[PDB]
């Protein structure tokens, strides 16, 4: 099983620097070129650069959009890919993906989950998490007033996923708010517990909020 996992994303100020990592497994790392691609919220994918395989001396190439400012490197002992970003600007705010690239034969990117980078002067603000309690019954959690993105919301630690709607965050007055609804049979709540699990990585916030009648 191939695995690519980005890390390093978060909040950084304009003019500042940040380095992302991409840990890989499940394939012969040195045989492969590796690319970085980014995606601003709601916008298209943008290829940023690659680092070639061993046969090609692990050389780098970059899009003109970031050449001179971004640097790619790799650790071939541990199979980790890196992206060094300098002189960051608002336009660099995006989800950054690593992707496995060329092996000398195939033309394809055979991707990580992505790590979100936010370039802003705003401070880190943890969310407030509030329960939403009133056949089938609908419950929810309001995740209010946080910065930067993202947050994650699960219900009963992942065991409720069907009947879940998580509403995209919207920015108002320099803070994000999102909500999530879960719909279950009335026979099961409040008989059984329903809990939303909320995380905000920027503030290392972890919240479990039980929906109480």
């Amino acid at each position: 099983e191939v695995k690519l996992v980005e890390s390093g994303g978060g909040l950084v100020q304009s003019g500042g620097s940040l380095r992302l990592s991409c840990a890989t497994s499940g394939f012969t790392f040195t045989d492969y070129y590796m690319s970085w691609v980014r995606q601003p919220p709601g916008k298209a994918l943008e290829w940023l650069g690659f680092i070639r395989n061993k046969a090609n001396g692990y050389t780098t190439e970059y899009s003109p959009s970031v050449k001179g400012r971004f640097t790619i490197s790799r650790d071939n002992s541990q199979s980790i890919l890196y992206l060094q970003m300098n002189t960051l600007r608002a336009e660099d705010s995006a989800t950054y993906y690593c992707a496995r690239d060329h092996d000398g034969y195939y033309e394809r990117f055979s991707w990580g989950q992505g790590t979100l980078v936010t370039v802003s002067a705003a401070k880190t603000t943890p969310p407030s998490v509030y329960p939403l309690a009133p056949s089938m019954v609908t419950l929810g959690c309001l995740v209010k007033g946080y910065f930067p993105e993202p947050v994650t919301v699960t219900w009963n630690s992942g065991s409720l996923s069907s009947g879940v709607h998580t509403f995209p965050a919207v920015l108002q007055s320099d803070l994000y708010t999102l909500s999530s609804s879960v719909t279950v049979p009335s026979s099961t709540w409040p008989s059984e517990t329903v809990t939303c699990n909320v995380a905000h990585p920027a503030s290392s916030t972890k919240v479990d909020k039980k929906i109480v009648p």
Binding site: L45, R108, Y130, G140, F167, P168
Partner: protein
Amino acid sequence: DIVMSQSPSSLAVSAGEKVTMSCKSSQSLLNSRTRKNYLAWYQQKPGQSPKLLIYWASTRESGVPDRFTGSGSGTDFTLTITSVQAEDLAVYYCKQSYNLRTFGGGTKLEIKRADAAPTVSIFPPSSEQLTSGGASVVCFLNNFYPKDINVKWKIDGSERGVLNSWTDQDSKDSTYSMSSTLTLTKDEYERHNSYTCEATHKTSTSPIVKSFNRNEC
């Protein structure tokens, strides 16, 4: 340089129907030596990373359903989906790898389905919010189609700090959902009694009305 362009920007198609989308390069992607077109297609479902579907213009990656077919050559390429399914909702990107790599701007595919009325639910502010001086009232309008919908808030019968958010289309039932949040100060919240979310959607000339009264909490 190599400019990649896609068409359409977006479209909607009913389940079972055929989808056709296009990708153009400013320069031929046909490599003389290998005789292959260096053009790949990726599918990006809501909240997910892109996934490889097609490469070398027409080679379908293992695990990808047969209903996806890549075609074309040189400067012009096509991704065709036959018998589209609800789960095919996604943005589709083409990407050249002839000279470094460049993505097109994507085609957003939505799924058309039968009109569906929303299920509306309203939620009073929690005591844990009120204690800090704020009062948010939330209304969920769930599983409707089409996407256009109107929400009005009424307080003591009078129309009125509102945060609206729509989900992406659902991959299973092709509906939308939206959340509407009205936020007041506790002081203002305590001056009124009836809080009402009213949803008007083309599925009925009657608004769906959900309310609660502060005195009943």
